[PDB]
């Protein structure tokens, strides 16, 4: 069905987080597969299993584990989804993209995002870090969308603008951030396109993929974003990038989740470290 | 769920219809987005609020005032939907091509759809008039589609063709008209895509719209043309190019329904003369 | 909603099949639009009619006979679907694909699958027969997939790949039995596009679908291969080509069913022959 959750819902979830926790963070952090240790870094930290917040989903796929986690990263109090819904286990995406409005009603005002993602620009590397500078919502182009159904003006407007979905001044200082670290990589940068899933895309597929223009593929994010843009949070964020998605037929190979977690742990503390230090850079 | 309408439903609707107007249009207009004036030439008008009308849906976008509207349009009996469904607003397809079905039940030979859109194909300029030649049905792509579910053979076969969707004699009428009305600017045409909605496109999802070939990009029209072929009845139209998407990232803009809606009003007068005059040449 | 049935279902049914015939085929065959003549080649056959099969789907679209036939094909046990089910129609693609399972419980190791479906290739002819060498799923793009919800791990995993969907050795075996054949016509190859449907495509539409890199469309299949290959069946199977696809707007001509059903005639003797052999090659 279309939305099911009314304006109270998210109230609801928002109050009873505000009454069980101090800490009052103005950035939101979504954790995709094999990025879970970013909580790590966090002091003062309080978590909350998803079941035990009324109304909110649950995480079922591995490397999620489900909880919702309030602490101060490099000196900025900050709540982190330690996993994430997506389509693909059964949920529509106003169940997937619950969390977004809650953390606005919470008083958030950034949200990063962040996810483990296919290489489809040849020139990416697995280990990469790529910043998502657009996106292309295929499930969007057939109404599949998380603000589907009547539109709630108490959280946006009804035709809401995506064109400048992720921040310009954010990717900007990820830019300089990147430098100040050292890396001898260059930092990624392009369009994410988000699919369905839960099975890995065939060759014929990804070459159309990255024919439409896209640089990474995954099956999450997008809807978060959209959301996100709706009720005004500025959005920014990035794909590790996990696996090069194989663009010849029968060229010795096959994507697997266990490639993508494994991936996730080389690169962890690369990111963890960035996103720590992009903590500073976020405004107010 | 699939099409929950029985036949019955739309005959009960077409009745009553019959018996609360003396009127008998061969031709029904679909008036989109900012195009409600059309009614306003209408002579001898009878309106039905779409909340009397027994099965009809509700027009909740803004600019979409939900009547129905019979009249005389330059001597032709029309029956006019001053506003129309949309996919994004939590309608199924069944329920956004009700209509369409009934006014074949009312004994419509013609359906003539309008819509504003942004333009894709570089060389149109916002007040573009654009014929619509052919369509790029997206959500039909995932099995979105009006005819999803057992096929009613009292209105049209199992697997209707579409490559003739749009009438080759009354786009060719169309253009005539235009010379006669002495239009300094040249009447477009082109190929529509329909995408779910409500969000506005993102660059990259425009770069691969125009790639795909399509000239227009809006969220309505198609499912109301394929349930029209189906049923028999004979379809043009057009869009109005209500602004030009951006093409290129930060490129300072963002599409808004405000300028949407704004700039049906300057090319209001334009498309409602040309419509009216059109009627002269519909056939019967 | 998501799948439905329980593994119990599933089981439930394939218990019910072998309890009421002798038969333990290992090769299953599933016949598209006017292809429901291969089950005439089978002896020993015991016919059993979906609406018979506790938990089975029906077949409403016409040349799709409904009929699970067991029988010996050129000396091999085979399990053939005499006529398939289809989004179109309504079902939703874990019901279209209850099938598949059910087979893999029955202790069937191989599935061939075969469709009716317009030429996009230039180069392909009515009657072309195209050996599926991978597809292009437009529906899971959006994340309608017959593996969306919770997964069931006793039939496969989370995230199965489908780079490798039709196996390699097969389709080698497949060319050197159209050799044996000695047919005039080379044995034609490549992608398989599904997309939802009953509509026909429109000019633009195939303009789209070729340009993706597609070489055949169909509204089948696809859900199939992606439930065999995630519970680790053998896939491989073709097209029939039986109509080339109107890529000129005007050019005149439109899709119908008739001739597909038509077309299945005249190569039905031809894919009959080719798959009777092909039994022999097909390993264990």
Same mark, same amino acid.
């Given at each position: 069905?279309?939305?099911?959750?009314?304006?109270?819902? &998210?109230?609801?979830?928002?109050?009873?987080?505000?009454?069980?926790?101090?800490?009052?963070?103005?950035?939101?952090?979504?954790?995709?597969? =094999?990025?879970? =240790?970013?909580?790590?870094?966090?002091?003062?930290?309080?978590? @909350? #299993?998803?079941?035990?917040?009324?109304?909110?989903?649950?995480?079922?796929?591995?490397?999620?584990?489900?909880?919702?986690? @309030?602490?101060? *990263?490099?000196?900025?109090?900050?709540?982190?989804?330690?996993?994430?819904?997506?389509?693909?286990?059964? &949920?529509? $995406?106003?169940?997937?993209? $619950?969390? /977004?409005?809650?953390?606005?009603?919470?008083?958030?005002?950034?949200?990063? /995002?962040?996810?483990?993602?296919?290489?489809?620009?040849?020139? @990416?590397?697995? %280990?990469?870090?790529? *910043? +998502?500078?657009?996106?292309?919502?295929?499930?969007?182009?057939?109404?599949?969308?998380?603000?589907? =159904?009547?539109?709630?003006?108490? $959280? =946006?407007?009804? $035709?809401?603008?995506? !064109? #400048?979905?992720?921040?310009?001044?954010?990717?900007?200082?990820?830019? !300089?951030?990147?430098?100040?670290?050292?890396?001898?990589?260059?930092?990624?940068? %392009?369009?994410?396109?988000?699919?369905? %899933?839960?099975?890995?895309?065939?060759?014929?597929?990804?070459?159309?993929?990255?024919?439409?223009?896209?640089?990474?593929?995954?099956?999450?994010?997008?809807?978060?974003? +959209?959301?996100?843009?709706?009720? %005004?949070?500025?959005?920014?964020?990035? !794909?590790?990038?996990?696996?090069?998605?194989?663009?010849?037929?029968? !060229?010795?190979?096959?994507?697997?989740?266990?490639?993508?977690?494994?991936?996730?742990?080389?690169?962890?503390?690369?990111?963890?470290?960035?996103?720590?230090?992009?903590?500073?850079?976020?405004?107010?």
């Amino acid at each position: 069905m279309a939305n099911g959750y009314t304006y109270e819902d &998210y109230q609801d979830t928002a109050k009873w987080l505000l009454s069980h926790t101090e800490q009052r963070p103005q950035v939101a952090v979504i954790c995709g597969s =094999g990025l879970g =240790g970013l909580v790590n870094k966090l002091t003062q930290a309080q978590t @909350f #299993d998803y079941s035990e917040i009324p109304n909110f989903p649950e995480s079922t796929v591995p490397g999620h584990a489900g909880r919702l986690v @309030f602490g101060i *990263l490099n000196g900025r109090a900050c709540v982190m989804m330690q996993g994430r819904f997506h389509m693909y286990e059964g &949920y529509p $995406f106003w169940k997937v993209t $619950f969390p /977004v409005r809650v953390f606005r009603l919470l008083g958030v005002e950034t949200l990063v /995002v962040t996810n483990a993602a296919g290489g489809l620009n040849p020139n @990416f590397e697995v %280990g990469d870090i790529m *910043l +998502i500078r657009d996106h292309i919502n295929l499930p969007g182009f057939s109404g599949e969308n998380p603000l589907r =159904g009547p539109n709630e003006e108490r $959280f =946006g407007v009804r $035709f809401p603008a995506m !064109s #400048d979905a992720y921040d310009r001044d954010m990717r900007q200082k990820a830019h !300089s951030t990147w430098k100040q670290m050292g890396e001898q990589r260059e930092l990624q940068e %392009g369009t994410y396109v988000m699919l369905g %899933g839960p099975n890995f895309e065939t060759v014929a597929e990804c070459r159309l993929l990255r024919n439409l223009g896209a640089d990474a593929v995954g099956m999450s994010t997008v809807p978060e974003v +959209i959301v996100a843009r709706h009720c %005004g949070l500025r959005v920014f964020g990035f !794909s590790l990038i996990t696996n090069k998605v194989i663009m010849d037929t029968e !060229s010795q190979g096959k994507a697997n989740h266990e490639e993508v977690l494994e991936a996730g742990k080389q690169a962890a503390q690369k990111l963890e470290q960035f996103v720590s230090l992009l903590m500073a850079s976020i405004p107010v």
